[PDB]
Amino acid sequence: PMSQQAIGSLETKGFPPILAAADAMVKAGRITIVSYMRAGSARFAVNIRGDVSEVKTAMDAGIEAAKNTPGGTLETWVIIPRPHENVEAVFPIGFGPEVEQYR
């Protein structure tokens, strides 16, 4: 009941910084971007999956890209190495059929 793949989630204020973060993340490690969350208050979170070491290196790049985007604000981030299956069942952080082609 715990997934093999880590989750990393990063949240910005602003849509352009989340795109910056997402692109930097997938260019920095063997990770898949699985989903995004429109959180309200102009905040957005991006969710990535991969082995924890790869998610950590991806997260470092996403953090920098968010902060370096003009007018962007990094709000919060987390890495969970081996998330319980019930988390994946309830939250939109699983692998959907549109990202299979990239994994």
Place this chain on the structure above:
Amino acid sequence: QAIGSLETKGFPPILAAADAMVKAGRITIVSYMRAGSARFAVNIRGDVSEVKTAMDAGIEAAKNTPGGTLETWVIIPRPHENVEAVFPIGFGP
């Protein structure tokens, strides 16, 4: 079964809380609520003693998350059945 509900500012800390809760007691995460203003609540069910231990872990995980903040939480030991008929805190699919 008891209900525990915990609410954070930010999506990453609600994930952290949820994962910590289900790894700390015999509970089921049944739903989450997008509250607006970048707040999210996670709802768990279990025997009250298990919900309590889970809640303690979830509070700590939310506060320990980079940039995460804990807003509010509750434990209701034996909720009236009318509550889960109206609020999305039941077990069913």
Place this chain on the structure above:
Amino acid sequence: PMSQQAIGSLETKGFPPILAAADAMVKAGRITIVSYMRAGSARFAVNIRGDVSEVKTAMDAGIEAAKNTPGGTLETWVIIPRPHENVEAVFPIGFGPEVEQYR
């Protein structure tokens, strides 16, 4: 054109305090919880129906439960003894088929 049953509505900041309020309300009087409103800004309202004397005693318990929830904030409440039918027609405060079994 005025209902036999009062409406009570109570609004909190935070989802956990609204659950606290709702549970305290239905445990304190002969009332039915009919609906909730996601108001934005992390505010939620719960709507109950019953005879006005029962809604008043329920409301007192809901107010206390909201205020006593960790991090919860009570925002606003009302009791309308005999609401006009047009209010029930437009606002989601009627009795739905999922709560018949509890009334």
Place this chain on the structure above:
Amino acid sequence: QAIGSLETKGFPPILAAADAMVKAGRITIVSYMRAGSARFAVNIRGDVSEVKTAMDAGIEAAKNTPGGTLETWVIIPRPHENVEAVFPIGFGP
């Protein structure tokens, strides 16, 4: 028919306003708007003299509600028909 629209912060005060309005004049409540930021607007229609009396009662009910606040209101006597084609202030189902 005239349109009256009244907006509160909070859901309980919009209920109070709506009920007071329909009990104060020959008007029909046609819709409500969830505006965001916990604001709600109620929309009524009737002859303008009736909408005026109703509006006065609704303003007082909103302000009199525990924790309720009145944000903004308007009365438009004879709205152009293009307005109700776009905004949800018409009578129809």
Place this chain on the structure above:
Amino acid sequence: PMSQQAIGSLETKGFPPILAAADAMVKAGRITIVSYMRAGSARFAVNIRGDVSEVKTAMDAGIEAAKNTPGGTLETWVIIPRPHENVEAVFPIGFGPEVEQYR
């Protein structure tokens, strides 16, 4: 690829001031109200179309009506004389079938 008709868009805080603006606009010039946008934070925008000279006179009336509504706030407005077709394709500012009868 640029429309013959200008767009004017006006945004208020509050729903009653947007109704005031919309009504004043269509009473002040040969314009069609095409749509409204629920922007969040209790802000609303109304979108009108017409020849630019007509949209300008309509906009002046909408600005005044918004400001003069009890508790209303004017937030922002624009007039674009000859919008590119790609703007109409992506943003909800075109003529829909419900407003044909008024144009």
Place this chain on the structure above:
Amino acid sequence: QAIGSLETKGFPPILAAADAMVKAGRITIVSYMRAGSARFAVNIRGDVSEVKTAMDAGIEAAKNTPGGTLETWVIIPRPHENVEAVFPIGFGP
């Protein structure tokens, strides 16, 4: 193709930005995002040199709009294809 994204407070300034961008370079406006808190983002695609010229025009149009404010913007020259599989920045219908 590159992605440019520009976000304003207010709906009128996003229209201004979008129109200025497509009139300043060989770009396609592919989508907009209602972000909440009355913020909106417009997303454009094109060769990066064209997206840059378009972005400059969009920044100026947003700031020049009465009451409009520019919040944030970005240009990504060569986005990874996983980004447009998840975010609504692709070309398709």
